[PDB]
């Protein structure tokens, strides 16, 4: 059977201006099967209350989802996104670069 | 709106 590795991406909704309110995003895609564990983390710790889109798929049947949360960027807080899947040895984390 | 006629694969 076909099994596919996810594609993680952390970003903000609007351009990151410190103190002003925004939304953190983690868009995961290109994977198979549907089961996926995706936590957004602040300073290594999981952000609870995290929403997500309704599971959907692309024309190669790859699944895709957008886990997100209201947040506020600071000059020292370090945000990230941890993702697990059966194609993954262990959780994969991607650090939020505000410029990417 | 979604289709309403069903079949089995």
């Amino acid at each position: 059977m076909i099994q596919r590795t996810p594609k993680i991406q952390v970003y903000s909704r609007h351009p990151a201006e410190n103190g002003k309110s925004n939304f953190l995003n983690c868009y995961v895609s290109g994977f198979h099967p549907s089961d996926i564990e995706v936590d957004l983390l602040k300073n290594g710790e999981r952000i609870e209350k995290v929403e997500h889109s309704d599971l959907s798929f692309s024309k190669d049947w790859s699944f895709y989802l957008l886990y997100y949360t209201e947040f506020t960027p600071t000059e020292k807080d370090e945000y990230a996104c941890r993702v697990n899947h059966v194609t993954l040895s262990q959780p994969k984390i991607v650090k939020w670069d505000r410029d990417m | 709106s979604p289709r309403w006629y069903f079949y089995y694969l």
Binding site: M1, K7, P33, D54, S56 | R3, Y8
Partner: protein, 276 residues
């Protein structure tokens, strides 16, 4: 221009752990407007876009009973494929279904879709003439004859040629320009020195809808691909999209590089040149 209505069905069988889960999701172009989730308590069809909320109570009740029927239909479809392929209770399998109609500025259908996929691989799909099927292996050929057995693509073409395009038209005129008009990207270029030798230029496109965009980097007005680093188009979260393209350039030669943005919401393609 071109518009499309698409429904995305995912059914995944859970052995021992309850009975399979069903998700529906509905798209006009690439705005999601409805959803259904069998894993819920009081599982309804729910609105996911403001221009669909005006539908009457009978719209929502009717569709809820469709998804409830559809879920049960895929359960036994999951079993039939298990038998075609001689698989086991040891196995979480997946049925993916996608159908929809693509219309031009006419109101005329250009391409209808009705395709399935078992366990990630393509199982069966309906040919563009809407009369034929194309089977991927010997299993799907039994489905292909099952599906000329009750003369089925007749009812499926009739939906694709018929009410599918009208439903698209109804949702287009109800969603007005917030759904028919294309929102153009807000584009700018950022400059990050990476060293003494070098620096990056990043062409940002933000706020655009629909998601189909093209971002190109040129040098001296001619093409340049072997330093481009593109990111996959990502949802902004507010029904708009985002993308960027990047190039590493010798420090002092930045002005020789132009970024080129194609998007339907633009009257003419953009070219951006970072100026010190």
């Amino acid at each position: 221009g071109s518009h499309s209505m698409r429904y995305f069905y995912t059914s995944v069988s859970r052995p021992g752990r309850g009975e399979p889960r069903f998700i529906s999701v509905g798209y006009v172009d690439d705005t999601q407007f409805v959803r259904f989730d069998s894993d819920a308590a009081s599982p309804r069809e729910e609105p996911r876009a403001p221009w669909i909320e005006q539908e009457g109570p009978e719209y929502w009740d009717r569709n809820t009973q469709i998804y409830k029927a559809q879920a049960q239909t895929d359960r036994e479809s999951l079993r039939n494929l298990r038998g075609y392929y001689n698989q086991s209770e040891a196995g979480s399998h997946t049925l993916q279904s996608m159908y929809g109609c693509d219309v031009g500025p006419d109101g005329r259908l250009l391409r209808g879709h009705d395709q399935y996929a078992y366990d990630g691989k393509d199982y069966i799909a309906l040919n563009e003439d809407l009369r034929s099927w194309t089977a991927a292996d010997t299993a799907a050929q039994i489905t292909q004859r099952k599906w000329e057995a009750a003369r089925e693509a007749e009812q499926r073409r009739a939906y694709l040629e018929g009410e599918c395009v009208e439903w698209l038209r109804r949702y287009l005129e109800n969603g007005k320009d917030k759904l028919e008009r294309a929102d153009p990207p807000k584009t700018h270029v950022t400059h990050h020195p990476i060293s003494d030798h070098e620096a990056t230029l990043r062409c940002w496109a933000l706020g655009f809808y629909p998601a189909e965009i093209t971002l190109t980097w040129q040098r001296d007005g001619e093409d340049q691909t072997q330093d481009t680093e593109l990111v996959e188009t990502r949802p902004a979260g507010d029904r708009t999209f985002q993308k960027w393209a990047a190039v590493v350039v010798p420090s002092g030669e930045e002005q020789r590089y132009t970024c080129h943005v194609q998007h339907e919401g633009l009257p003419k393609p953009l070219t951006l040149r970072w100026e010190p």
